[PDB]
Curated annotation (Swiss-Prot):
One GO term of the biological process aspect: killing of cells of another organism
Source species of the chain: Gallus gallus
Protein name (Swiss-Prot/TrEMBL): Lysozyme C
Cellular component GO terms, alphabetical: cytoplasm; endoplasmic reticulum; extracellular space
Positions in coiled-coil regions: none
Positions annotated to bind substrate: 101
Known EC number: 3.2.1.17
UniProt miscellaneous comment: Lysozyme C is capable of both hydrolysis and transglycosylation; it also shows a slight esterase activity. It acts rapidly on both peptide-substituted and unsubstituted peptidoglycan, and slowly on chitin oligosaccharides.
Primary enzyme class: hydrolase
PANTHER family reported for this sequence: LYSOZYME C
Domain (C-type lysozyme): residue spans on this chain: 1-129
Gene this protein is translated from: LYZ
Amino acid sequence: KVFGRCELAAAMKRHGLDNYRGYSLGNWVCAAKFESNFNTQATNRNTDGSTDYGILQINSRWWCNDGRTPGSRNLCNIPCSALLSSDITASVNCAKKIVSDGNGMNAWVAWRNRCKGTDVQAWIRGCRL
């Protein structure tokens, strides 16, 4: 499922991301934008052979189980599959653990590189929230 910009913000907000660990709703929408382009089914192979999954491209080395990542962890105790469904619950829940991990939203390289310090409020401009 490809979410619309405000439709993702709404779902995100309903699942308690709005200001989670201090990161306002605009940051999470910006990060989704650049990680998956609002598509739940986005996957991408990292060079180490782990795979990034979902709206927020959550990595299998640490956070989910895909059975094809030698030496990895499944710290969100989910199949990476869960991160690709229309229902963003698993994704949001697993984002919450990642962003709590000590490094904040920097855990997402695209957010650091493309969202950090930008007018992130733009991403929620004009949404019924």
